[PDB]
Amino acid sequence: IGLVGKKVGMTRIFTEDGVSIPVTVIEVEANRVTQVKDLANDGYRAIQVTTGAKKANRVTKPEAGHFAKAGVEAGRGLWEFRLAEGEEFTVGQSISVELFADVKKVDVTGTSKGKGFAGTVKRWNFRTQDATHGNSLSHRVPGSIGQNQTPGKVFKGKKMAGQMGNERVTVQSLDVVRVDAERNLLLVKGAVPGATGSDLIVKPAVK
Amino acid sequence: AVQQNKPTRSKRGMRRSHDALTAVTSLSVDKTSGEKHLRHHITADGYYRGRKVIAK
Amino acid sequence: SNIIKQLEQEQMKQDVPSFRPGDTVEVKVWVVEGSKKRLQAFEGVVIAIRNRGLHSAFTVRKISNGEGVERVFQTHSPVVDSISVKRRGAVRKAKLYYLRERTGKAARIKERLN
Amino acid sequence: MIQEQTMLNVADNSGARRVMCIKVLGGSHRRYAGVGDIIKITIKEAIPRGKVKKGDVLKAVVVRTKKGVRRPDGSVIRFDGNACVLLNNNSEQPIGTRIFGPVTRELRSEKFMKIISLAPEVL
Amino acid sequence: MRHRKSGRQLNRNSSHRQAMFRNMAGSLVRHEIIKTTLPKAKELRRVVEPLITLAKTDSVANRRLAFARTRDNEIVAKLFNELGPRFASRAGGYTRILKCGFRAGDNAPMAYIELVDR
RNA sequence: AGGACCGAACCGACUAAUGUUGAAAAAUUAGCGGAUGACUUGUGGCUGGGGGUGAAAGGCCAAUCAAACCGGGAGAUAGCU
RNA sequence: AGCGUCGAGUCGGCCUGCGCGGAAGAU
RNA sequence: CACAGGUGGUCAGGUAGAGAAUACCAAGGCGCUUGAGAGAACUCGGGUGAAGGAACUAGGCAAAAUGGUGCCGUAACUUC
RNA sequence: AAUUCCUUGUCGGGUAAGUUCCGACCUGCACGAAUGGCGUAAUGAUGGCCAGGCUGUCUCCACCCGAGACUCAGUGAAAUU
RNA sequence: GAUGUCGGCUCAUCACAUCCUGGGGCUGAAGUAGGUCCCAAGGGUAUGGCUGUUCGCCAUUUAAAGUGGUACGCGAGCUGGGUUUAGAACGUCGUGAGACAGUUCGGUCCCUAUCUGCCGUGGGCGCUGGAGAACUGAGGGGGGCUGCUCCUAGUACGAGAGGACCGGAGUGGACGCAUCACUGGUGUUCGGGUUGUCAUGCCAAUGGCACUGCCCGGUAGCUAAAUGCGGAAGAGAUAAGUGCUGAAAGCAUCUAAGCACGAAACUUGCCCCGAGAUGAGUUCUCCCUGACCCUUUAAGGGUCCUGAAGGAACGUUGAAGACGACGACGUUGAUAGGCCGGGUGUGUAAGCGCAGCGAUGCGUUGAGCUAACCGGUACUAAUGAACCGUGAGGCUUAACCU
Numbered sequence A: 001i002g003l004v005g006k007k008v009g010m011t012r013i014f015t016e017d018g019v020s021i022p023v024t025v026i027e028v029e030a031n032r033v034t035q036v037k038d039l040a041n042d043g044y045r046a047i048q049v050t051t052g053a054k055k056a057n058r059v060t061k062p063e064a065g066h067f068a069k070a071g072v073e074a075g076r077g078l079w080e081f082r083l084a085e086g087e088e089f090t091v092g093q094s095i096s097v098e099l100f101a102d103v104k105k106v107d108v109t110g111t112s113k114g115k116g117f118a119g120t121v122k123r124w125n126f127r128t129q130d131a132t133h134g135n136s137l138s139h140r141v142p143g144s145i146g147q148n149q150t151p152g153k154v155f156k157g158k159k160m161a162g163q164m165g166n167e168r169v170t171v172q173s174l175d176v177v178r179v180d181a182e183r184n185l186l187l188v189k190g191a192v193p194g195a196t197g198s199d200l201i202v203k204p205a206v207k
Numbered sequence B: 001a002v003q004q005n006k007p008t009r010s011k012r013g014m015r016r017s018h019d020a021l022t023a024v025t026s027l028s029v030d031k032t033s034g035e036k037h038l039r040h041h042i043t044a045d046g047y048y049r050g051r052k053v054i055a056k
Numbered sequence C: 001s002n003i004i005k006q007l008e009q010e011q012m013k014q015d016v017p018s019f020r021p022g023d024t025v026e027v028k029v030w031v032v033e034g035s036k037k038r039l040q041a042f043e044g045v046v047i048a049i050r051n052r053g054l055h056s057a058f059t060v061r062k063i064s065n066g067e068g069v070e071r072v073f074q075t076h077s078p079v080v081d082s083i084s085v086k087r088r089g090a091v092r093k094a095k096l097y098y099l100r101e102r103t104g105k106a107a108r109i110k111e112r113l114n
Numbered sequence D: 001m002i003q004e005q006t007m008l009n010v011a012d013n014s015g016a017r018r019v020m021c022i023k024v025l026g027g028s029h030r031r032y033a034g035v036g037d038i039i040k041i042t043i044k045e046a047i048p049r050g051k052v053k054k055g056d057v058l059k060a061v062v063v064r065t066k067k068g069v070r071r072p073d074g075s076v077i078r079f080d081g082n083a084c085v086l087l088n089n090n091s092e093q094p095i096g097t098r099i100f101g102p103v104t105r106e107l108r109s110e111k112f113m114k115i116i117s118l119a120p121e122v123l
Numbered sequence E: 001m002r003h004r005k006s007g008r009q010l011n012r013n014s015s016h017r018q019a020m021f022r023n024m025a026g027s028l029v030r031h032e033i034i035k036t037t038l039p040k041a042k043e044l045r046r047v048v049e050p051l052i053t054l055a056k057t058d059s060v061a062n063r064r065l066a067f068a069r070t071r072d073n074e075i076v077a078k079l080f081n082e083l084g085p086r087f088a089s090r091a092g093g094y095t096r097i098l099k100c101g102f103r104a105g106d107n108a109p110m111a112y113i114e115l116v117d118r
Numbered sequence F: 001a002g003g004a005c006c007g008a009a010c011c012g013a014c015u016a017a018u019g020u021u022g023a024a025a026a027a028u029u030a031g032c033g034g035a036u037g038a039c040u041u042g043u044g045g046c047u048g049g050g051g052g053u054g055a056a057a058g059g060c061c062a063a064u065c066a067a068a069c070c071g072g073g074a075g076a077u078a079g080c081u
Numbered sequence G: 001a002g003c004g005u006c007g008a009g010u011c012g013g014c015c016u017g018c019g020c021g022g023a024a025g026a027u
Numbered sequence H: 001c002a003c004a005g006g007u008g009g010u011c012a013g014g015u016a017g018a019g020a021a022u023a024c025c026a027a028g029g030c031g032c033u034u035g036a037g038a039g040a041a042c043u044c045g046g047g048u049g050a051a052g053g054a055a056c057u058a059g060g061c062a063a064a065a066u067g068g069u070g071c072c073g074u075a076a077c078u079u080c
Numbered sequence I: 001a002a003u004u005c006c007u008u009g010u011c012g013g014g015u016a017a018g019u020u021c022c023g024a025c026c027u028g029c030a031c032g033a034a035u036g037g038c039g040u041a042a043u044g045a046u047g048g049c050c051a052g053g054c055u056g057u058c059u060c061c062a063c064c065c066g067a068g069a070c071u072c073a074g075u076g077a078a079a080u081u
Numbered sequence J: 001g002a003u004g005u006c007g008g009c010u011c012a013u014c015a016c017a018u019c020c021u022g023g024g025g026c027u028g029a030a031g032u033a034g035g036u037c038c039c040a041a042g043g044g045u046a047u048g049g050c051u052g053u054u055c056g057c058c059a060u061u062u063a064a065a066g067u068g069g070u071a072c073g074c075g076a077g078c079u080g081g082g083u084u085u086a087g088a089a090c091g092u093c094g095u096g097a098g099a100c101a102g103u104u105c106g107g108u109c110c111c112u113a114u115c116u117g118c119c120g121u122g123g124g125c126g127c128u129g130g131a132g133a134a135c136u137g138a139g140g141g142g143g144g145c146u147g148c149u150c151c152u153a154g155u156a157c158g159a160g161a162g163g164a165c166c167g168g169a170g171u172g173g174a175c176g177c178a179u180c181a182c183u184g185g186u187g188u189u190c191g192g193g194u195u196g197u198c199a200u201g202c203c204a205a206u207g208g209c210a211c212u213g214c215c216c217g218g219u220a221g222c223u224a225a226a227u228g229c230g231g232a233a234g235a236g237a238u239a240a241g242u243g244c245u246g247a248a249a250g251c252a253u254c255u256a257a258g259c260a261c262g263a264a265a266c267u268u269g270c271c272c273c274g275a276g277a278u279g280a281g282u283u284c285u286c287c288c289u290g291a292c293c294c295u296u297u298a299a300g301g302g303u304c305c306u307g308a309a310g311g312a313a314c315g316u317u318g319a320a321g322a323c324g325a326c327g328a329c330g331u332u333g334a335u336a337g338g339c340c341g342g343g344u345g346u347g348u349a350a351g352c353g354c355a356g357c358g359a360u361g362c363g364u365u366g367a368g369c370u371a372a373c374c375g376g377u378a379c380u381a382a383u384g385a386a387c388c389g390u391g392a393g394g395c396u397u398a399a400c401c402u
Ligand SMILES: C=C[C@]1(C)C[C@@H](OC(=O)CSCCN(CC)CC)[C@]2(C)[C@H](C)CC[C@]3(CCC(=O)[C@H]32)[C@@H](C)[C@@H]1O
Pocket: J002, J003, J004, J005, J084
C-alpha cells in the first residue's frame, strides 16, 4: 500500500561529502482506514483511507455517516489502495509515514499544474516556422494537419492545441531521502507533480 | 470558407438551444426597508442589510 | 513553510562572516583527489550575493593565470570550509557585473575605510 | 556550451590561436559540447611557425567555457572565454607541450591526465 | 497563465493605470464616497488604504511620499490632518465596497466605495 | 562655382511587415531616393481618337486604352453555349 | 528394409481426379 | 461614408538644438461617437534574453548595429 | 562571358567542404569593333561574391508590455446556398 | 461555367521489398570482422559547403543516416528561389513583327469555417425514489531508440597479428514526463542612477512626458540552457529456426498422435483516460414514514399540508480557467483585500548637522523604500433569508420469511 500526503515544497539536503540533494517535502499525516474492501462484498481487496481534517459544516450527512461507521474523524478526502495477498488492515487503523522506513524508492502521483489552453509549440514541442523570410501570420501555427483526398480526414490522436496540465501524473522511482515519523515528513529526491499544497499519493516503487 | 448548403431552420433552433436567458433565482428582502433587491447589492432606496448606506 | 524553514534552519552554518559586494574574500573549499582531501583557496572580489537562507550564494571573480574566472559558491555547502574577508571594498551597487568588462587599473575597487 | 560554428581560444602551445568547432562528436543530433567533451575543429588562425597550420582539421577537448560547469553542491564555475586543447585526430593525445590558464577537475580522467599535469591550476 | 500574479490590467497600459488610480484615490479622499466600476473599486483599495496607513505617522518624509503618490496637497493635508487621525486605532480596512447594480450605458457592474466612518 | 555634398519642408516610391468582404478600388508603419534643378507647385490656356501626347513603359488621354467616352447603324453576325 | 540372418510383399515409371508450395504494398 | 488618403497661400512664442529636425512646453486646440470585464491558444505592434553567433535563408529577408562635434590620422586607384 | 549547348569544362585562389564568386586557359555549340570593341576614376534604393562588426535569422525558444481574439451590454454585415 | 503546379518549411500517416537495433540457417564462418538467405515494422533512422534544386558531389558525424505509398501527402497551413504574363538585354533564328524544351536582371500568393474530420471543453437527458462519495475495468490511448567504457579476459580462438560469445557493472546521446530546490532568462506592478524639458510659488524635494526616455539591478510567477524521473525486468502465446520421443514407410524422419525450446513483432506487465460499458456495473453512507377529493380505474388526474438529504444560486476567491467547468471559503469565518511582523530586492531616503569657495563628501544610516512571498491578524467584504429538489419509490416470477 501507499499513503496520501501533501506537497509542502522543495528544498535541499546537504550531505557531508558536499552533495546537495534536491528534495520534495511531503507531509504525510496519519492515514486512517475508513473502509476495508474484500472479495466477498466488493469483488476486490483494498483499503480506503482518509487524512487531514475537514470543518464539520463542510462535511455532508452522507460523508459524516461513512466516517462515523469507521469510527474516524472526517478528513479532507477518501482514497483507495489495493491490497496484496499478505496485507491485512482493520477499519479505524491509523497508518503513518513509518510505513516507508525501509522503502528505498517511491512512485509519487499528483495533479500537474494547469497551463490552460496551450498551443502546439508548448503542448507538443512543435517547431516554429520562420520568424522572417516572408512568413505570413504563421509563426507558431501548427502547419499541415493531414494529407489530401486520401485520406480526406484528420486522424484521431492528431497533436493539436488544447488543455495542458491539470491532470494526474505519476513520477516513478524517486529515492527516499528521509522518513521523519516525528514531524510526519517524507523527503524524496527530485521534483513531483503539482503545486505547493496539492495532494500526493506516495506508493513503494512498482519497478 | 462558407456553407455549401443552406442550414435548416431546425439546425438554427438546435444551435440556439443554449441561448435562453436565466431569470434571477430569487430577490432578497431588506430587513429594514422591506424592499426587494439583488442579493449583496444595495436597494434602490440606498439600504443594505437594514442600514441606510446611501442617502436617496 | 514553517515545516521547510525548520528543515532549512537545522542545516544552516552558524558562523558565516559578514561580507558585502566589492570585498575581497578568500574561500577555502574541499578538494577530494582520491582518499586525499585538502583545502584549495579561491580568492577574489565578491560581485554578487544572493541572500536566500539555506539557499544563499555568492559569486567571486578572480583573474587566474591570465583568465577571468567566476565561482558561484553555495554559502551553506559543506564543500565551503571557510570564508575570510581580506579587504573591504567601497562600491555603490549590489551587483558588480560591470567589472566583467574591466581589467587592471579600470577594475580597481576603493577600500572601505570604516 | 559549444556548438558547430563556435569559435574557441586555444589553451596550449600547439600554434593555433583561434579554432572553430565543426562537429560535436559522440551521438546523433548531439547539440552541445561542454568541458571535457571532444569536438572536431578547423584552425582559423595560427602563429607563423607552430605544430599546426591554418585550415587543418583535427580534434580538441573543451577545457574552459563561459557557460561553465556545475558541481554536486549546486556551485558553478564559469570562465570569461571558451577554450580548448588540440588533440591528434587519431590518438586524441595533446599536440602541445604546455597548457595555458586554469582547467577544471572534470578533465581528471585517464584520457586527459596529461592536460591536468601541465595545467597551471585545476579548479 | 497568471499563476499567483496580482494587479488588474483594466485594458490600459501601466502609465494610464497609475494616473487613473492617483486621480481616483484623490476623489475618494476628497468626497469620502465615490461610485465606480466594481473591479476599479477593488483595485482602488490597494492604492488608497496604504495612503491612509502612511498618513497615521505625520512627518515631512511621509507627507512628501504621500505627495509623490497623490500630487495634490489638498489630499495630502486631508490624509494627515483628518483621515490618519480618524483611523489611528483601526488596523486596515479603511474602505468598504457596496455593490449597486449596473451602469445604463454599458451594463458595467458598479459599486460605491466609501471610507468606513463616513 | 556646382543637373556639388549632408539634411527638414516639398517632390518621389527601393525594401519589409500589415492590410487584401481594407481605415484606403493602391494605403499605413518602419526604413529609402531627390532636395538650386533636365527641380517643384498654384491659376489659366493649347493639343482630340487611327487622333493627341510620350527622356519610349504600347505609357498616359477623367478609377476606361494594341485605338477613350456617349449616342446612333443596331435586334451587327454568332455553323457556338 | 534394417541387422547369412530375415519372413510378405516390395519397387518406380506412365495416365487421370482433388489438393500443397511457388504467393511482397501502402487509412 | 462624420472614410487613417488628397488639397495652394499666410502667420511662426519658450527651453534645449545647426535647424521650420527632434524632445518637452506657451497661446490656442483636442482625448479621435460603442463601452465594461478577462488576462487562454493564435495573430498584430513592441521590450528583454543564458551559451552560441548567419549554423537561418534562394538571399543576413527582417532585426541587431553604426550614428554628434572638435582634433589626430587615413591605402590602392584617379579623369588630379 | 548579361553570349559556352556539352558543363558543376580544366587549372589556380578562397572554404573543413564552393554547380555561385575571383584569376587563368581557349575547345568562341553560337564574341568582335558607332543595331560599336576593349578599358575606365567617379557615380548607383543596379546584378554577383567575400570579410569584420552585429545580432532571436537560426540552434530553440522563454518571459514580459500593449492591440485583437474570449465573456457581458448596445448596434449589427458578407461571400455562399 | 478552373481538380493551384517544382523545391523548401511545418505537420505527418501507412507499406515492408529492413538502414540500425532483435532472432536465426548456410558460409569459400578460426577469432575479430564479413558474405548471403530467412523471420521481424516495436522504436529509432545526420548537420553542413555548393546549387531553386529534388538529386548529386564534397566535408564532418552516426547504431543507422532505409526503400516506397499517401493528388510525385501537406499553398482555404507558410514560403515563392525554380517555373509560366506584361519591362529589358545577350547568343541564336527570322527581311520583319517576333521567337528559343537557350541564357540573363526585375517582377501583387485572397478567403471571418456552415458540414465532415480532428484537438480541447461544457449544456441536456438517460441509467427507474432521491442524494453524497469511493470504486470495478469492458474498452481506448501513451510508452517501447541506442552509444561508449570497464569487468568477465588479454580468457576462448589464433602461427602470429589480433581477439570474442554468454553474463555483469558504469557512464552518455537523442527523445519524453514532471518541477522550480539549485544555475540562469524574463520580471513596463520593486529599488536605484541618469539626459532633455514642463510643472508642483521658489529653494530643497518630487511628479509628468520623451520606446518602460535611456539604463543598472531584481521579488513572486512563468520558464530551459536548470535537475529529478522514464524506456525495463518478469509472464503468456509465437515467427524464422532448433529439438525430444515417434510411426505411416521393420530403416530413416522435429510431426502424422504426443512433448520441449525459440525475437525489440503479438497478449500482458508500466503510465493515462475510462460505466453514454444504453451490456448505462459495484460498494459505503445519507434523506423523505401527511390528509383528502374526483373521474375517461389508472405506472390516472387534482387540492390542501409538507419541502428532507442534497443541490443550485449569490458573494469572497484559487499555483483552476477562453467561457462553461473544477477547487477553497461565507462570521460557528483566514476566502480575498487591508493591516502587523518577517523575508526579499535595491543600496546608506528625506530632514538636519559638519567639512569644502564649490561640484560634492561625511555623519545620523546598511538608511529609506520595497509587487505577486512567508508567518499571523476579523479591520473591510464574504447576509437572515429566498430558490430547486419531496412525502418510502412499477409489474412478473423465484427463493426465503409470515
Ligand atoms: C489556371 C489553372 C490552374 C490554376 C493551374 C494549372 O496549371 C496550368 O494550367 C499551367 S498552364 C497555365 C499557366 N497560367 C497562364 C499562362 C495560368 C496558371 C494546373 C497546375 C494543371 C496543369 C491543370 C489543372 C489545374 C488543377 C490542378 C492543377 O494542378 C492545375 C488547373 C485547373 C488550375 O486551376
